[PDB]
A paper describes a structure:
A comprehensive function-structure study of a representative of a new clade of proton pumping rhodopsins which we name “mirror proteorhodopsins”, from [name] ([name]) shows cavity/gate architecture of the proton translocation pathway rather resembling channelrhodopsins than the known rhodopsin proton pumps. However, [name] shows completely different pH dependence, operating only as an outwardly directed proton pump only at acidic pH and having no pumping activity under normal and alkaline conditions. Another unique property of mirror proteorhodopsins is that proton pumping is inhibited by a millimolar concentration of zinc. Taken together, we believe that the trimer is the native oligomerization state of the protein.
The crystal structure of [name] at 2.8 Å resolution is markedly different from those of the known light-driven proton pumps and, unexpectedly, has remarkable similarities to channelrhodopsins. Similarly to BR, [name] forms trimers in the crystals. Each protomer has seven transmembrane α-helices (A to G) connected with three cytoplasmic and three extracellular loops. As in all known rhodopsins, the retinal co-factor is covalently bound to the K211 residue of the helix G. The extracellular part of [name] differs significantly from that of in BR, with two big hydrophilic cavities present in the structure, separated by a gate with R70 in the centre. The first cavity EC1 (we follow the terms introduced for ChR247) protrudes from the extracellular surface of the protein down to R70 and W74. H37 is found at the position of T46 in BR, therefore, it is closer to the RSB than D96 in case of BR. On the other side, the H37 side chain is located within the hydrogen bond distance from S84 of the helix C. A wide cavity directly connects the cytoplasm to H37 and S84. Thus, compared to BR, proteorhodopsins, and other proton pumps, the [name] structure is distinguished by the presence and complex organization of internal hydrophilic cavities at both cytoplasmic and extracellular sides the protein. The histidine residues at the ChR-like cavities and gates explain the inhibition of the light-driven proton-pumping activity by zinc ions.
Author numbering:
A (entry chain C): 2 to 228
B (entry chain B): 2 to 229
C (entry chain A): 2 to 60, 63 to 227
Write the structure that this text describes.
């Protein structure tokens, strides 16, 4: 409940501070540290909002949808994707090159979030699942870019940075896949799991995706940079 | 009306897939392919929303406003403008150079859309037209950047890429000008033409602007690259 | 109140036109001119909205959504210009982007959190959010004053002098906003809505119009 949101805020607020301090401030690593440190600060703001039910909509039938949660995802996810794109290019790209991939992957990712929110708010089952599927299509669009063309470039340019990108993407894919799963089985979908259970699961997921991943990604870059 | 939206979605969904696959994946062409392929995918999501009247607000005495339509325009138009800016610079610029023109042209363009939405929703005629005009001012702001300074740079840097930009801009101008015309004539404005007729017209316009233009722009760039 | 908004629109509309015309269209200066000219045009659109009470919420306490909408876009653009100055108009792939994203995220959050504080009808919540917004502002100020300023000075004296001058001016003016909020009807309600509105207009002109011309002069000094 409130306790989960307050735990989320505290973890995310501290983590953001920790990620920046601990993170490298040198050359290419710096801009990765800045991006990774920002995500939790957004998540923190979101979680603080959710504790006081700011942005949280209560349907006539007492059903709750957290706008703040989706608002977080709409900004954070793209920032995490942006960091990955830069890794793939090995921190060098000509005018418009990285920008094109960024725009492509952000558009898909943000749409994935927006469509997911439309699905959540949909009170008609048929519509709810049509939109969920479209969201999933967007997610596959994101995953395709990451796993095929971007990963292709990631490996082509060198083993060290290619190894770092592949490690980061793998971790990202598994964690990111939990969100659509939780949605499906959660109160926004099949309603197999309780609101509180889904919220508690998301907190654990959010910490892995934003905090653990950040420290993991830093180690993979630091290991790769050493070579 | 819903049939038009479903037709729009299907055309835009397929087109997006087609544009990416057909588009070149090499050097400067690649980043143009990625940007051009994204637009229809947004438009598609928008059109799907509109079929189920998701963003659609209904006001008495025949006033409908499709929020999803404007949401599409607020993202797509800038992406199309972004692609043009990159063309003008001949796919090379110093730090912040392209960014300055992007921010400038996006701010004007997005404002043009936002102001247009305010105009559509405005219940006082005087306000509705004040905002329409302000939107038009923004559009002129966009057109100025495209046609004067950006076109100047486009031609100065080389004939091949300059020819491609000029062709793309010309096509852009004519199509983009239809939107303010339809708005004026449409239920959002003078209510001279029916909601359904205006919606069907916009679908035709949207296909030209996002799908036909994409293939046209691609050909003009590939023509310029081969000639060079 | 409406007269202030109409005055704001007219000042901001003309200023934006003036800033572009007067601004240099060459090399690094150009992209600074384009960014600086756009800000007032946003502010203008905002002020026009506010005169006709578009985005203005009646709920007893009144909060101008158009005002915050303006701030959420303009402030980042002004911060973006400063970041570019610090790098001396040269940075490797992703370098400037990382600092931009960092400083924009903090800045935009600062605005949105401030809006949450304004809309909050419960005092305790209103001040929790105000403080969080302030934390974000300090986050912005830190980046500007420490790491970005460090790079600004390290790269050369001329551009380092220009950045330091611009930042100083920015900090002082930008600090008025949280002060006005605190003592204004969105906070302690020590000063009237009209007084706060008229004060913000004066502040907004300094921050977007005067600062633009000041920043332009400082860059032309640095280029010479
Ligand atoms: C390759 C250059 C980067 C393109 C940026 C695309 C701008 C997106 C506009 C979104 C505004 C809403
Ligand atoms: C460094 C330059 C990269 C900047 C990234 C640009 C990303 C643009 C953001 C796109 C957002 C699209 C999501 C909006 C969907 C709205 C569609 C309406 C459906 C109801
Ligand atoms: C929102 C309006 C301004 C968006 C500008 C984004 C352009 C990014 C270029 C680097
Ligand atoms: C040189 C590039 C300048 C980038 C400016 C982008 C402006 C970001 C504002 C978006 C925040 C909107 C929040 C609602
Ligand atoms: C909707 C939010 C999307 C914002 C993501 C923008 C991240 C940009 C990553 C930095 C790119 C810098 C490249 C410079 C060349
Ligand atoms: C060039 C990168 C600018 C993107 C700014 C990030 C927007 C964050 C929104 C909160």
């Amino acid at each position: 409940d409130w306790m989960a949101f307050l735990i989320g805020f505290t973890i995310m607020s501290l983590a953001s501070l920790a990620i920046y301090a601990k993170g490298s401030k040198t050359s290419p690593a710096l801009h990765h540290t800045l991006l990774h440190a920002a995500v939790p600060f957004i998540a923190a703001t979101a979680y603080l909002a959710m504790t006081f039910g700011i942005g949280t909509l209560v349907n006539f039938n007492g059903s709750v949808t957290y706008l703040a949660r989706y608002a977080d995802w709409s900004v954070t996810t793209p920032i995490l994707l942006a960091s990955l794109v830069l890794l793939a290019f090995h921190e060098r790209g000509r005018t418009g090159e990285v920008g094109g991939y960024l725009t492509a992957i952000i558009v898909l990712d943000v749409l994935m979030i927006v469509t997911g929110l439309i699905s959540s708010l949909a009170v008609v089952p048929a519509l709810k699942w049509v939109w969920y599927l479209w969201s999933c299509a967007a997610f596959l669009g994101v995953l395709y870019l990451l796993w095929v063309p971007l990963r292709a470039m990631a490996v082509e340019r060198g083993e060290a940075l290619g190894t770092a990108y592949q490690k980061n993407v793998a971790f990202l894919t598994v964690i990111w896949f939990l969100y659509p799963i939780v949605f499906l089985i959660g109160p926004e979908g099949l309603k197999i799991i309780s609101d509180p259970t889904s919220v508690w699961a998301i907190l654990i997921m959010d910490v892995l995706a934003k905090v653990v991943y950040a420290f993991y990604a830093a180690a993979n870059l630091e290991t790769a940079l050493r070579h």
